[PDB]
């Protein structure tokens, strides 16, 4: 469910209990990267990977806390990979 401390979009008012995620930084990695993402990273560190394993990531900006409405997915694609130390995911800039 996430190794980094996952923030939630959760308010507690009179029986409101639902584990919902605001699509933070470290959970789109949990989805896009392989299921060995919440597991097999206790002592390992994996700074490897450059496969273009997806190209339709623009299906996430609607719940990715809209910031760049006039750009489709350049924020999602060309910014991640550098700070996202797991892989690169893009042979455009690295």
């Amino acid at each position: 469910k996430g190794i980094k401390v996952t923030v939630q979009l959760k308010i507690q008012n009179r029986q409101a209990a639902a584990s919902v995620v605001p699509s933070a930084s470290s959970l789109v990695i949990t989805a896009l990267k392989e299921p060995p993402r919440d597991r097999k990273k206790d002592k390992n560190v994996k700074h490897s990977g450059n496969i273009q394993l997806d190209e339709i990531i623009e299906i996430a900006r609607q719940m990715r806390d809209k910031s760049f409405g006039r750009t489709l997915a350049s924020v999602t694609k060309e910014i991640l990979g550098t700070a996202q130390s797991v892989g690169c995911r893009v042979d455009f800039k690295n």
Partner: protein
């Protein structure tokens, strides 16, 4: 010079055909909460809170395609701001004045006008009830709720927001430091 010439290019392109002309003064601002109004207004009116070029904001119009450009040349003052759109401007001022989101003063900055504090219920557990000695306001706790006994003056005209007696005015939820976007002049073409 060369590094700043793009600001001339960016104003020149905008000053070719776009029919609306509108200036606004933005001296006090909360930029963060005033750039979600820059994101709700995507592509409608590109904002321009420019630099001291007020002198050749009108001089550089030597092309004189719209020779009224010599319109704010005797107005080299203030924080003039340029917005423009191809729609009737009478609807934008509805949305750009409602955003009067406010914050406390700079720990004691100016006070907009004299503020009177009544006895209005808030609904919180006893917190700073043991910290009402700087101003000396009588406060009683009932059923676990803070209630003001007597209405005591806080601020005055002539004197400004304090730091010991005024740290709780936004616990009373007033808007002393807002200075929302203000129209200064409108002219089309």
């Amino acid at each position: 010079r060369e590094k700043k010439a793009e600001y001339f290019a960016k104003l020149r392109e905008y000053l070719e055909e776009y029919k609306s002309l509108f200036v606004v003064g933005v001296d006090n601002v909360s930029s963060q909460q005033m750039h979600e109004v820059r994101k709700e207004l995507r592509g409608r009116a590109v904002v321009l809170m420019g630099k001291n070029t007020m002198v050749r904001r009108a001089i550089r119009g030597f092309l004189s395609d719209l020779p009224d450009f010599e319109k704010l040349l005797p107005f080299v003052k203030g924080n003039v701001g340029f917005v423009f759109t191809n729609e009737p401007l009478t609807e934008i001022k509805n949305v750009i004045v409602s955003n009067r989101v406010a914050a406390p003063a700079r720990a004691g900055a100016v006070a907009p006008e004299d503020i009177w504090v009544r006895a209005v219920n808030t609904g919180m557990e006893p917190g700073k009830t043991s910290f009402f000695q700087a101003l000396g306001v009588p406060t009683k706790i009932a059923r676990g709720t803070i209630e003001i006994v007597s209405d005591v003056k806080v601020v005055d005209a002539g004197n400004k927001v304090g730091q010991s007696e005024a740290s709780l005015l936004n616990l009373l939820n007033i808007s002393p430091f807002t200075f929302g976007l203000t129209v200064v002049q409108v002219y089309d073409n």
